Write a protein that binds this ligand. Sequence first.
Ligand code: MTX
Ligand code: MTX
Ligand code: UMP
Ligand code: UMP
Lengths: 288, 288
Amino acid sequence: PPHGELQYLGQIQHILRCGVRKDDRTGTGTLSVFGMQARYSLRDEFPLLTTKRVFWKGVLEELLWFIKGSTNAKELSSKGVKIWDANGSRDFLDSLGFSTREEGDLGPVYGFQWRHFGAEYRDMESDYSGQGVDQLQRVIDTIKTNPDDRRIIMCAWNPRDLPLMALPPCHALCQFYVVNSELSCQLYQRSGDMGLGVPFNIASYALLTYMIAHITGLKPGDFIHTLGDAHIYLNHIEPLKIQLQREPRPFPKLRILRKVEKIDDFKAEDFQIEGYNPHPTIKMEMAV
Amino acid sequence: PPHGELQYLGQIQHILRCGVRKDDRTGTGTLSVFGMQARYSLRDEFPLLTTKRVFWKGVLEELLWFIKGSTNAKELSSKGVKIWDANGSRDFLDSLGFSTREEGDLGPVYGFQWRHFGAEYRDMESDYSGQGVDQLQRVIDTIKTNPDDRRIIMCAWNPRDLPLMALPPCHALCQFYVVNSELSCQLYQRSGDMGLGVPFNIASYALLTYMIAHITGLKPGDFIHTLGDAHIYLNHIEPLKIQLQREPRPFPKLRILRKVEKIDDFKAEDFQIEGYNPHPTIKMEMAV
Ligand SMILES: CN(Cc1cnc2nc(N)nc(N)c2n1)c1ccc(C(=O)N[C@@H](CCC(=O)O)C(=O)O)cc1
Ligand SMILES: CN(Cc1cnc2nc(N)nc(N)c2n1)c1ccc(C(=O)N[C@@H](CCC(=O)O)C(=O)O)cc1
Ligand SMILES: O=c1ccn([C@H]2C[C@H](O)[C@@H](COP(=O)(O)O)O2)c(=O)[nH]1
Ligand SMILES: O=c1ccn([C@H]2C[C@H](O)[C@@H](COP(=O)(O)O)O2)c(=O)[nH]1
């Protein structure tokens, strides 16, 4: 049965063969399937794709930025990771009616929701200590005290806060699961740019699972990737067909370099990707 | 093309063969798999399971109760549907520390979240008109004005309100999708009692999709059922093996008997299940 990267490549094939033409906001157009699911083992391997190089630096710095609760694009940008900068620009903020908002202030996105769900958002520089639900720490506490729990959820989709966000979250929610000393994670991704977003998104949530497993004394299990609108932008078709011709190399491994006690204490240098031997980057133009 | 019900029966088989032993609060125990997905066509058929009779009256009355925004178990009970009554009882409310709460008051569950997400909950008798986000109406409006939208979400998972609820929602969220004049729906169900809950849950969201398609002038497409902890209670194993001997009968059809303009105007007598030929109920004791 296909395993690891062949799940992702199988999804690409399925959308090319069975996807339906579907317009989008950008006017680019897509081939689209609604509802997919892939399973990536995390057991002695880390699912960083090898058929094209994934932006691992971006994955790791973005995740650390989420964990600290930041909603400031400038703070991620300062680390050489520019993926949120367009959505924090003066022009983009004004386009949403946020003329009074400071440049970089993404509103109550991921970081805020994860650490302060339900608090009143003010700006990206405010102190939210003790405010709202700390979903991330509550996930960790539940795994430690009640691993059988079937409500181990972290949700970024906050209908009250959506109008203030720079972008509605794509990763609406995730759920953790423990059995036989293994930690698994399922992501509900409402919308997946299969060429540009999804490889990165797989790595983010696999990383998060490695982090939480390390904190809780468990072994990584599976990452289950569930998609809503799974789509290939029309201008990614030829690049993806090039990618599909490449034979995958074995996944790398991820090493955590020291014992870390609290999720907030992880730093970028604590992580080491080993044996990563990807084929070259394939240029895929982003839609918006 | 295979009967859609064989997806469900395939899931039962997979859990019996590959599910792992996993304890629960009741001490019943389960066999459990994390992460499953099935697709049920809604095109000229309604996926009301035939290998054991589904409580259709319960499906329909519960859904109408959700749509009106109710959080009062007594109001559902009055229609002959007792499925929430134990969770609203004096005893159960007291067991959660809700000694001051009136009997029947489930707290900010589905109905409240769907129609008033983010409003302040008081009690089951309060007027919430105009308060919070009406997710249900916003879903319907978006389908009508911008069908390509990839953010058509209704979320019941509200971390701020969880501690007031009689039970945390199993149906954490759902997402709608439109292509070629067909409306599809995906449910993220965090926890699935495969014997007792899941058949009912499939029917609820298929129904909701039929309702919203009727309101918006679209044809029903697919229902995609995604599970988190998909589990068989140990005392359902033998009953389910009896069920697995049965060949499915062709699915019924669902007829909507008049033109209805607003989701709030649907009544129970507007719906007719046609050609439903289930095998008999098999007794499966619920875990408490
Ligand atoms: C998670 N994320 C957001 C993302 C992904 N796909 C999208 N696709 C579309 N159509 N629209 C989006 N806003 C979008 N956003 C990402 C992730 C990576 C990069 C990125 O493409 N490239 C690095 C790579 C640099 C390197 O490896 O040397 C960069 O140049 O910013 C962009 C956005
Ligand atoms: C969806 N749902 C809630 C549900 C399902 N499985 C669960 N399973 C567990 N372990 N715990 C729960 N709280 C639970 N809740 C249901 C659905 C049907 C019935 C049920 O008992 N139906 C009828 C059948 C009667 C008829 O056909 O007219 C009844 O006798 O009440 C109960 C709960
Ligand atoms: O982490 C992310 C962020 C965005 N996207 C995608 C999906 C869509 O192509 C686009 C978002 O647009 P909307 O779904 O909100 O229309 O970027 C991803 O795949 N991953
Ligand atoms: O609509 C519903 C409501 C509940 N359950 C199940 C799943 C679990 O077996 C139990 C709820 O318990 P927790 O997952 O919250 O532990 O009832 C369903 O399958 N469907």
